[PDB]
């Protein structure tokens, strides 16, 4: 049963504004088990009018991060041991109780383009989007510096961008050298 | 000794090269590596695409009498980015999150010249040869925006003349008054406090938009366009049909 | 006419619980399943959520998903100089069969 | 034959046709 | 009916062929197979030679 | 050394057309690449830009 027989199709076009210097999420495409194919995304940029002439270059980046369901479980159950292991999540799926449950709308969910669900008149969205965004943000931060500040599963807003080169790396430095070397 | 050393020293550097070359496993993969074990691979996230571009510029000049005399003009910035990558098949699936960030120029402006900001003294090359230890790099060597107390504090502990291998600066002349050049305001760079918290992969929580009229306004206006084709094993069962009033009314089947 | 593209519709997967499908059971499903309101748009009254709009399909709400609208975080009061928005905001849900504009 | 004014346009694809649905299915099929 | 049957009957035999063709996983691999999951491979023993 | 170029931008409003208002813009570019003279005690290279 884990073999391709049919196909899905999504076509989401969205528009919005995001402040400069902030790592603003734009979209969140869901991927279920035993699925694959091609993904094509495009984003336009248009800044507000700037007085005079601009010579300092402005850089715009586009990034895509794949967050497995296993990683998202760790944030939801951090204190639990073996929380993010494949067998644990695999077993919990068989139980019947949904692994992820709906939560109220948040800026991350709203900016990711997921439309809500009217549950008793209240907008609802699954918790996976928020958890995935926080884990993706941490993954990007860890690339520049492993011992970077980590976001919990309580974040419900955009995050500041990440520097291209830290001060310590720029000078090829170190906070605490070793005596053996 | 001197054989356990010269081996532990060399073996230590191998450990250091694993934590940074294999992030998000620091202080845990090296331990398993020494004992000859491995980690669970499927829990970790990974990157799919990474695109960057520098915004272009177009200048529109005013033609009215006031604009011609004063020299009024506008700068328009726009860019396009797109990628096409395959989706990684997994047993339990995952979430693909996209990001779009606009940043100013990351170039320093407040940093004393290593040579011209210090005393002109004759170096002892012979003595410098016998120097293979981490020397201090105290504050006041990175920027002139340092408080009285912070000058003595050590920011990072590394290097022998490392502050002279490369020097990069981009900023306005100190003689110039920033109140002017409001029509040539080509200044947008990160004025990080520096010195304090040298290790930081995070932008300041509030980055003002000096060139823009409103600093708190969201300058950019992004339009996204995503198309995804995802082979899936879902059944996608049949499509029912409507009911014909003639049947069950005139008894065509009887 | 303006663009005929939907803007108010929950995501079939991300707006519902993440549950493991029983493929064997879904094979033995060749009957018209209900498609209740609140599966087509989030602009639904309290009473209309339970009502059945049309009675068809097995996972038919996932074969194709098309959306074109502004981000919910954005304030429509802005982008009055980039007002590229003209699409039919049909009430939906009520009167699913309708070949007539408002 | 009492209409004396223009009429609203016609949708390119109805909601029911968009999802390939039906208001009242048949029991025989 | 007679289509759910003639399919459940055929689908049942496929399940039967997995428990015996893949022993030491009976009544557990078929359940995961239906939902589209897998088992941990490294725990199981295996045979090397038979003379 | 170089002589600045000129570009003329004319007003189009009614007042500018009648009076004939216009602006003059002057700009230039200068650059050189020379070797640094090696000395035992060094020196200072000072650059100037005069209009």
Author numbering:
A (entry chain A): 3 to 183
B (entry chain A): 257 to 510
C (entry chain A): 359 to 460
D (entry chain A): 155 to 183
E (entry chain A): 257 to 307
F (entry chain A): 308 to 358
From the paper:
Here, we have characterized an exceptionally large microvirus, Ebor, and provide crucial insights into long-standing mechanistic questions. Here, we report the structural analysis of the genome delivery process of a Microviridae phage, Ebor, along with its discovery and characterization. This phage, infecting a model aquatic Alphaproteobacterium Rhodobacter capsulatus, belongs to the microvirus taxon ‘Tainavirinae’ and recognizes the host via five Gokushovirinae-like trimeric protrusions. The capsid exhibits the triangulation number of T=1, being made of 60 copies of the major capsid protein. The core of the major capsid protein contains an 8-stranded antiparallel β-barrel (single jelly-roll fold), the fold shared among all Microviridae.
However, examination on the cryo-EM grid showed that all the particles had ejected the genome. The ejection likely occurred during the blotting procedure due to the reduced stability of the S120 variant. Otherwise, only subtle differences were observed between the major capsid protein models, built into the maps of native R120 and empty S120 particles. The respective models exhibited an average RMSDCα of 0.55 Å with the maximal RMSDCα of 2.3 Å occurring at the base of the protrusion.
